[model samples]
Target: PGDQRFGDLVFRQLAPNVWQHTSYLDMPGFGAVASNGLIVRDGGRVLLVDTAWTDDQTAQILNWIKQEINLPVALAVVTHAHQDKMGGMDALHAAGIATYANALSNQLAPQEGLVAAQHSLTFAANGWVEPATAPNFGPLKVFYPGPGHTSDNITVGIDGTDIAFGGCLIKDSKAKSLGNLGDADTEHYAASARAFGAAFPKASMIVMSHSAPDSRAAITHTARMADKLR
Candidate 1:
């Protein structure tokens, strides 16, 4: 990862086409914490899973995509309303990249003193009607999966690769508690995860918003933590 550099930002390649940008955030009360975002590729087309902790870090990733990956970013996907997920949208907008999120994120971001993302997917039909869509990028699918870390949290699935990005709802291996749950739906967290687990049972490689990609262990940990909260 020390060699994987973009300006000052660092990237750790998780798999063939999946990478994670490492950064840090000053969490309220808990002080600073390490954070990361996933970068996925489909040939010359790329899907950026989340922004870094700030616009400058995000800028580094976008430049690296252009100069190194040699593929234009097709979409900048935000996993939640929190700064660690969507804070660097201004950089993406400046670079003319399309941004997307669930409808709940768009509505709640501003209320939390954060800017809203540009495009959105609806929680519609009341029957897990995931579009299995990736906008202008690869064959990526999105699922609300119900809320754990936040009410609008979503998980991303790579159709051809069988990898999933669980964002904050999916905890990292080192996470002692749920990490940050200021916006979590603690009561229904386990149920939400059960819904996702049932839907994407084939995700062999699961990526979290802030940790190394593992085989369903991180997600399993989060679900158990949900039960503990009850």
Candidate 2:
């Protein structure tokens, strides 16, 4: 694939106005796994669903966003507390680019030595992040329909587009099984996915945290895997 190059990072258009950056990560026990993230440009502002795999790679991504989109990234939305998702928080924060994460992730990321996002948005009964009840930036909104891959795994919906960034909760089409279940909910995985799908009934594209982007088939595959795990 002729992936577009920006600085030292590589990315490709997954859909209209949406690009994906796949980066190799030094995940312990998993060796070097390919971690990925989504870059969505909604109107003038840009939003990143997740960072690549490392702070250095994320730096390159942030630069590309400024150069290509001609606007700073409004928010770097993290899906969970895992390193692969929150690895670039510190880097993003350093650049003065704001980042948001689920409240559960806010409470769990520090335990793994990862820096917390700049803002904390509530996804559970806890409530909103500070003075705002609904935390949204640009044309994208955050929702915690339910959990599956991780406790605080949240989904991002891009308005005016039939796309939903499900992060690790929605598996890719090439995924033979659940990629990493070290912190997965095998029992509630199916129910969570169902709830998530219902929350975004028109979503035709589902983007995950790793591997390639796929159509709605990914959601079907993820739900099927949840049944297998049962």
TM-score of each: 0.89, 0.88
TM-score top scorer:
1
Tens digit per residue, CA lDDT, model 2, 1-230: 76987756678887688888777766678787877788888777788888766798888888787777787677777878887788888788888877888877888888878888877787543211232634456666677756688878888777788878788888876688788888887888887777767777798877777756678878877888898776
**lDDT of candidate 1 over 1-230, digit per residue (tens):** 33386666778777788777777777778776667777888877888888988898888888887776888888887888998888898999998888888878989989776777888777554424345434464566777788788998987777777677788887755578777789889899988876776667888877776666777776777788789876
The whole-model C-alpha lDDT of candidate 1 against the native structure comes to 0.78
* Whole-model Cα lDDT of every candidate shown, in order: 0.78, 0.77
- Looking at model 2, report the run of 10 residues with the lowest lDDT sum: 125-134
Question: lDDT of candidate 2 vs native?
Answer: 0.77
lDDT of 2 at 221: 76
Poorly placed runs, candidate 1 (over 4 Å): 1-3, 27-31, 124-134
Which portions of model 2 show Cα errors greater than 4 Å?
27-31, 124-136
Candidate 1 lDDT at 225 equals 79
